């Protein structure tokens, strides 16, 4: 089979900056190489096909290079809008191979997290359960911390976190906290804490309440 | 203009079969190639294999040999993918696409996709749960627990209020998979305009809207 | 061994708008008269261009085909001197040096692609006076700003199936192969040159690469332009169908995809004889190989 090794696996680039992404083919392929962008839940589109051909209606920074076994893909100047995943195919014989996909994320400032408590709903009490969720939202980097206190106890077990894909309109992550835990436990505490430290502001940011 | 529409989601148990659909129209599939793209988390993109339905002839990529089979119906303008001897790796995405033409290999037109989950645990539905505030800017929570399989549909108030929502990623904790979504709108809407969740989950054919309201308590 | 077949030479005019084959018929735009008798009977306003095909066009097939008949002559001439510089055993029967025959092949062979120019200028000049007589005849359609696309699309079905009839990516493969296995064996041949020495054998290989060469880039060509046939026929086939247009873009829309259609069918007779020629080449020098290796003793 013809391996297609694409180069790199993530980028992080910041508005206006030239992107590069390689691709190396283990067999000479002339330039049979196509370039596809995949954004989540979309099914992927095809932007350059073989012999550097700009596909109607994909914009001009937009490009590619090489013939043989050495291409590259580039982006002229980012934009907010090229977030995706991209991929390499080549089309010169089967069985087709992909690459093994670049993720390309935008640069942006950083942007401390709006935290928000929220004690569990009656309608779960109800049903026996008790989860206490917290939302940490609009922040940048990716990268942030959630401590969970019970009485001022840390708590490590019952917790779930879910990141956030980079949104569209602002480049923030945004990620969600939850902590489930027994009806009859929820009810032998009194106050429930949770603390978000992120890069931005060395000291965390708390939010909490107390089940009265 | 050229549209496939491919068949809807699938829950199969291990070690099962199960058969993909893919309609096309604005086009002839006879003068074409079909093909067939796996499409799984973490593991990009993966051809399956192609079909020219003149013919019938198939073509496939040698880790699909033996538990894939691609076919054609002319008469219906379809295409069809059969999966056998299913495994929890076989959890993806299937899409459907064109070639560019006779001169033109590469992929050209897609279909939606097909949710193919492959798994033992049965079908169930949703408990929907509003989160308000503890009792400027106001944030609202959803709370959707303990549904299997994947996908549900959340949006607030049908879909007509987006800006400032987020819907997370859903995290699959022992057999169920537990969703929530968060979203923000200054002080002066909420609560005096009414704000609403609203959960679809098509497998276990349930639709639910919750109103956020105030604790009281 | 020996070719005693060089369809493979072909010449285009001095304004590269025409290529001369000598396969029939000789010029693509043939084939795309042939093709608008196809959409005139549908038409019933310009089935009088049944006159024009049997009498202008049937005129100008014979006379591009009496044109190439004249080339004969020369033809063997050219002939004559491949089958002296590819085969060692018939060029050591002669006195004369490579390099002497070797400027004699590239004189011939010009002198004989420069008849089938020279013999077919005045059918060159009748192309366009047939093209600019359909484009009058097709005024004659009753209609001006809605005229009906039924017909343009009826033809585009028809050559989609016509397309899925050309094993092109077959084409593809064995012209990368081949173009693989020529570029290797021209680098090989100027490594072991230096170790065995041989110099009629080593050049009658070099000669056959030199025509290898000349018959893929003609291969490579045509494969190119039944490509971009295909491509641009599919396009129209996916894109958007307007049920009426003006005339004249009419007319452009006839002589877009006859001309599309003229150079696929053009481009599949000549890339099914290269291929043939191509195959015959690589023997001859695998064969010229075993005699180079196969009396070291
Ligand atoms: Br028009």
């Known amino acids: 089979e013809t391996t297609v090794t694409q180069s790199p696996a993530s980028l992080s680039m910041a508005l206006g900056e030239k992107v590069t992404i390689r691709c190396i083919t283990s067999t000479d392929i002339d330039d049979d190489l196509n370039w596809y962008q995949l954004k989540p839940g979309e099914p992927p589109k095809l932007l350059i096909s073989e012999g550097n051909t700009l596909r109607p209606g994909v914009p001009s920074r937009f490009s590619s290079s090489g013939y043989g076994t050495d291409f590259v893909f580039t982006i002229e100047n980012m934009l907010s809008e090229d977030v995706a995943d991209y991929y390499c195919l080549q089309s010169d014989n089967l069985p087709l191979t992909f690459g093994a996909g670049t993720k390309l994320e935008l640069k942006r400032a950083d942007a401390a997290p709006t935290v928000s408590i929220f004690p569990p709903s009656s309608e779960q009490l109800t049903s026996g359960g008790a989860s206490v969720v917290c939302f940490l939202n609009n922040f940048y980097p990716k990268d942030i911390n959630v401590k969970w206190k019970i009485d001022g106890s840390e708590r490590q077990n019952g917790v779930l976190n879910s990141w956030t894909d980079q949104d569209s309109k602002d480049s923030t992550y945004s990620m969600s906290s939850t902590l489930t835990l027994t009806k009859d436990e929820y009810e032998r505490h009194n106050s429930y804490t949770c603390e978000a430290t992120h890069k931005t502001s060395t000291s965390p940011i708390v939010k909490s309440f107390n089940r009265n | 203009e050229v549209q496939l529409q491919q068949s809807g989601a699938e829950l199969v148990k291990p070690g099962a079969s199960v058969k993909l659909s893919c309609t096309a129209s604005?086009?002839?599939?006879?003068?074409?190639?079909m093909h067939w793209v796996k499409q799984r988390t973490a593991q990009g993109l993966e051809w399956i294999g192609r079909?020219?339905?003149?013919?019938?002839?198939?073509k496939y990529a040698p880790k699909f040999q033996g538990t894939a089979t691609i076919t054609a119906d002319t008469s219906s303008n379809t295409a069809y993918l059969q999966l056998s001897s299913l495994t929890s790796e076989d959890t993806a995405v299937y899409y459907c696409?064109?070639?560019?033409?006779?001169?033109?290999?590469?992929?050209?037109?897609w279909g939606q996709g097909t949710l193919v989950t492959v798994s033992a645990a049965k079908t169930t539905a949703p408990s929907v749960y509003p989160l308000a505030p503890v009792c400027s800017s106001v944030t609202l929570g959803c709370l959707v627990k303990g549904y299997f399989p994947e996908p549900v549909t959340l949006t607030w108030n049908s879909g007509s209020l987006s800006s400032g929502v987020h819907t997370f990623p859903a995290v699959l904790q022992s057999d169920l998979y537990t969703l929530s979504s968060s979203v923000t709108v200054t002080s002066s809407t909420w609560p005096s305009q009414s704000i609403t969740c609203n959960v679809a989950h098509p497998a276990s054919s349930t639709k639910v809207d919750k109103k956020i309201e105030p604790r009281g308590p | 061994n020996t070719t005693d077949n060089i369809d493979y030479f072909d010449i285009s005019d001095e304004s590269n708008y025409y290529l001369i084959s000598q396969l029939r018929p000789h010029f693509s735009n043939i084939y795309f008269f042939d093709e608008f008798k196809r959409y005139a009977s549908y038409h019933t306003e310009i089935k009088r261009y049944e006159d024009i095909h049997k009498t202008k066009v049937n005129s100008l097939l014979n006379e591009a085909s009496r044109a190439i008949g004249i080339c004969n002559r020369a033809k063997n001439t050219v002939k004559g001197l491949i089958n002296i510089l590819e085969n060692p055993q018939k060029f050591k029967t002669q006195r004369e040096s490579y390099d002497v025959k070797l400027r004699q092949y590239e004189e011939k062979k010009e002198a004989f692609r420069g008849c089938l120019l020279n013999k077919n200028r005045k059918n060159l000049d009748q192309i366009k006076k047939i093209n600019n007589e359909i484009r009058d005849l097709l005024e004659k359609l009753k209609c001006s700003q809605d005229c009906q696309t039924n017909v343009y699309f009826d033809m585009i079905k028809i050559y989609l199936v016509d397309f899925k009839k050309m094993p092109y990516e077959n084409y593809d493969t064995f012209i990368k192969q081949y173009k693989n296995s020529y570029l290797s064996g021209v680098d090989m041949i100027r490594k072991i040159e230096k170790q065995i020495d041989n110099p009629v054998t080593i050049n009658a290989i070099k000669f056959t690469q030199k025509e290898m060469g000349y018959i893929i880039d003609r291969f490579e060509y045509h494969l190119q332009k039944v490509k971009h046939s295909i491509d641009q026929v599919t396009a129209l086939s996916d894109g958007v169908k307007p049920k009426q247009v003006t005339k004249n873009r009419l007319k452009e829309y006839y002589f877009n995809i006859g001309n599309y259609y003229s150079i696929f069918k053009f481009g599949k007779d000549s890339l099914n004889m290269l291929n043939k020629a191509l195959i015959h080449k690589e023997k001859i020098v695998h064969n010229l190989l075993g005699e180079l290796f196969g009396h070291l003793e």
């Open positions: 696409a064109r070639s560019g033409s006779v001169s033109s290999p590469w992929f050209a037109y």
């Open positions: 604005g086009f002839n599939i006879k003068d074409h190639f």
């Open positions: 079909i020219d339905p003149e013919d019938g002839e198939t």
